[PDB]
Amino acid sequence: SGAIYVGNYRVVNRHLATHNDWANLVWEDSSRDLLVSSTTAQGCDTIARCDCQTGVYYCSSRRKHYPVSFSKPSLIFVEASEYYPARYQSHLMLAVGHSEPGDCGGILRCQHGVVGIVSTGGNGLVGFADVRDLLWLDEE
Ligand SMILES: CS(=O)(=O)N1CCC(O)CC1
Ligand SMILES: [Zn+2]
């Protein structure tokens, strides 16, 4: 589990979005595994605006943050998980690392701020849904 809180937005994995998220929907994209809902309180997070390929991510199934190198966001085939069938996921970054389903929502961060959240795992990789292209998160 986990979210990003920027301005009056809450960014979660689409597959972990609650009824309250869907009832306060701003934007959602199944192909990216992202959903954004509206918040009452202002968020603590700063979104990275950059093309870094190194950062640190939180792994809840290890209670640990790991430094990783990761691929640039791309359209990638993802094998079936407990929460999606096998499918193509867009805006996905991969790194070598540990990820189980419940690790979804862990933050990946670089020197510029939050890059994305854990979205995929298995076969010794961790996949992250990028948010650095969602410029509208930073205003309004
Ligand atoms: C219905 S779901 O959550 O998308 N998911 C489909 C693939 C299966 O491996 C687990 C269940
Ligand atoms: Zn960066």
Measured from the Cβ of residue 28, the count of other Cβ atoms closer than 10 Å reads 16
Going by DSSP bridges, is the β-strand pair 34-38/87-96 parallel, antiparallel, or unpaired? unpaired
Q: Which residues partner with 29 through β-bridges?
A: 34
| CB-based contacts of 124, cutoff 8 Å, min separation 6 | 96, 97, 98
Give, as one character, the DSSP assignment of residue 14. G
For residues 23 and 18, give the distance between their C-alpha atoms in angstroms, rounded to a whole number.
9
Helix (H, G, I), strand (E, B) or coil at 112: coil
Rg of the chain taking only CA atoms, in angstroms: 14
Q: Which atom of ligand 1 is nearest to the CA of 84?
A: 4
65 is catalytic: no
Q: What angle do CA 27, 31, 35 make, to 5 degrees?
A: 30
What resolution in angstroms does the PDB record give?
Answer: 1.1
- Buried b vs exposed e over 86-103: b needs ≥16 C-beta within 10 Å? eeebbbbbbbebbbbbeb
51 is catalytic: no
- 21, 33, 45, 130: the catalytic one is 33
Nearest to 14 by CA among 120, 132, 137, 98: 120
For residues 30 and 63, give the distance between their C-alpha atoms in angstroms, rounded to a whole number.
28
Is position 50 annotated in a ligand binding site? Answer: yes
59 is catalytic: no
Nearest to 50 by CA among 126, 131, 121: 131
Is position 19 annotated in a ligand binding site? Answer: no
Q: Which atom of ligand 1 is nearest to the CA of 85?
A: 7
Measured from the Cβ of residue 79, the count of other Cβ atoms closer than 10 Å reads 12
Nearest to 73 by CA among 15, 25, 11, 31: 31
Nearest ligand, measured from the Cα of 122: 1
